[PDB]
Design a protein around this nucleic acid. Structure first.
Ligand code: GUN
Ligand code: GUN
Lengths: 338, 338
DNA sequence: TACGCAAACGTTTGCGT
DNA sequence: TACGCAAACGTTTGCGT
């Protein structure tokens, strides 16, 4: 305890502190002396004590959805550096889209008194929106929203509609007119948003799409498997499918193999995410890339700012995606005709 | 503040507390009354205050190596549930095998006063071992050690040597006598340990292995790529390779493709990890599976026990791996001869 | 029976001199 | 010049009555 180091140090605690935090000038002797005792006495200042005083834990919370999915894990890993190089402590908590679950992690959140709050709950029902607001006191920012759903938070928008668009365009220019689509859950942004972007181009190109060629996915490889399966299992099949996510595409890739179909010789897959190891998919995945890092870093920053600069007004910064050409896509049967 | 709810509640704080923690009987009126104010006044008890008093933060720290690699992310995700269903708060911090880095996260660790400590630093040099010990006060347990490296911690041993063994045996019985190997870093347990297991069987079967058929990997898909590449790029090539890790195998799978070689028609790949989505590799990955969940859950538990049961003696629980047959492996040219 | 007092936990910090 | 006092932060808890 400080009372213990000051003692061994034959100096006031006020002194022990002033040297611990270089908050005011202290003679060299006194300085050194404190230190020695600090070391021999083996002192570890109590952050909890210091925070009960200074009104800030210096730790930010993460109300995530899950932490194993490649997509998530990369953002999550991104944040942590940011937290660390800026002095913060990361508190991770996955709600699994569970209201109860979130209401709890949110609960312990404020209790432990997180200086700030990063959110990625995926689905945002009225109930959620509700609970979230009752903590509008604690600074926060949702990082996975299509557009600014609330006025009480900060947001980083991905322009995922623009991405869904970019993907379809590619297919078109490639020669395809018979595309399919295994989208991510519609309650989601990266779900509906991407699909909706992809579908503008279609109409923009008078391309229709039979319902039998559009199957819901949940970002789980198993789901990609089942869809791709469902797709090619019907008499008339498309020549190129737009896969809602990379790890789903990764799963759709598998099925086509066991299918006996070649890729991209038989099917053309265009994903979306650009996961750390999508380049090494087999084959190499052509895909849309989301700036996961910046989506992360940008978030942490807005928080700090709102924090340290006692910001009060909400905000929302956009981020942008870009096509990444790999090997899952070939020319369509209309390429030369354009 | 409590002083604020008790006031609005026209009752002593001692009362406000006794109802907040059901620590002693309180009349219904008084009870209800407190509550109302608790709600209208919108009170969030201060955990930091309560902990500065009760001597326990109710939060455990995670001094990980990294959090994006599938292997890690799965354990990490495992822990968090365990933490959550048992009432704890997860603090995540990746040291990136950086001494300085770890010494820091370890530093802030004790400061914030983690009730317990989970470790997975991969490489454990004397320097590390040193620093770690100076916190032997704070309860902990390394979860990625070959054998009990220290007497001041708890350990969960994976029997990764037994796994490396299981893998080689498979190859043998399959018909192979010309195997290769892309192992994970030797400073590691899952590195050296697995390799060393795999190599006993070899000798146990009078199988030698040309150095030109053994290439260091770092668990990174890119590394698997380069090795597999290096391997088949030499005049005489093996008929089956044992891949140190799944995500590396995943990377070796790619190269062979671009190689023009078929798998398992041309090469036979046997990985090790059994990652959440290795089944969906292309082809479906035959591999050794580590009980990631239990490796996680078991760890959290030992910690609690050491914690709540004020345990003092070190411990070490083993966990076991098992072969998972998929599609990356075919009979060798010696199968019928046995 | 049902509750209230004050002291304590481990720090920081405004006055001082 | 260089340092020391005491009060405060937001709770819990042993005596009480
Ligand atoms: N698994 C997963 N992948 C995604 N890609 C974009 N959004 C998501 C998401 O919420 N989950
Ligand atoms: N990436 C990675 N994979 C592993 N598989 C077993 N151990 C490890 C490790 O330390 N890192």
């Amino acid at each position: 305890t400080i009372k213990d180091v000051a003692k061994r140090a034959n100096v006031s605690t006020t002194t022990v502190s002033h040297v611990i935090n270089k908050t005011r000038f202290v003679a060299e002797e006194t300085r050194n002396a404190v230190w020695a005792a600090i070391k021999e006495l083996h002192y570890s200042p109590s952050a909890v004590a210091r925070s009960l005083k200074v009104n800030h834990t210096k730790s930010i919370g993460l109300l995530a959805t899950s932490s194993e999915a490649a997509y998530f894990a990369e953002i999550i890993e991104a944040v942590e550096k940011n937290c660390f190089q800026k002095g913060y402590t990361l508190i991770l908590g996955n709600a699994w889209n569970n209201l109860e679950k979130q209401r709890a992690y949110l609960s312990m959140m404020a209790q432990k008194r997180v200086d700030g709050l990063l959110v990625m709950c995926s689905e945002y029902p009225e109930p959620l929106l509700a609970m979230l607001e009752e903590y509008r006191h604690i600074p926060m920012v949702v990082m996975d929203w299509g557009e600014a759903k609330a006025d009480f938070t900060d947001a980083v928008i991905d322009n995922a509609f623009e991405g869904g668009y970019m993907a379809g365009r590619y297919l078109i220019e490639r020669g395809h007119r018979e595309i399919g689509v295994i989208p991510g859950p519609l309650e989601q942004n990266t779900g509906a948003g991407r699909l909706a972007g992809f579908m503008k181009a279609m109409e923009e190109a008078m391309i229709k799409v039979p319902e039998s060629w559009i199957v819901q996915g949940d970002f789980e490889p198993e789901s990609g498997y089942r869809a791709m399966q469902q797709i090619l299992s019907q008499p008339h099949r498309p020549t190129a499918v737009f896969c809602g996510g990379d790890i789903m595409a990764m799963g759709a890739l598998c099925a086509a193999d066991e299918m006996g179909l070649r890729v991209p010789q038989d099917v053309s897959l265009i994903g979306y995410d650009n996961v750390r190891n999508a380049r090494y998919f087999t084959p190499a995945l052509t895909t849309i890339h989301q700036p996961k890092d910046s989506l992360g870093e940008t978030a942490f920053n807005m928080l700090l700012d709102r924090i340290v600069n006692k910001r009060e007004e909400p905000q929302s910064i956009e981020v942008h995606p870009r096509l990444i050409e790999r090997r899952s896509v070939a020319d369509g049967p209309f390429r030369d005709y354009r």
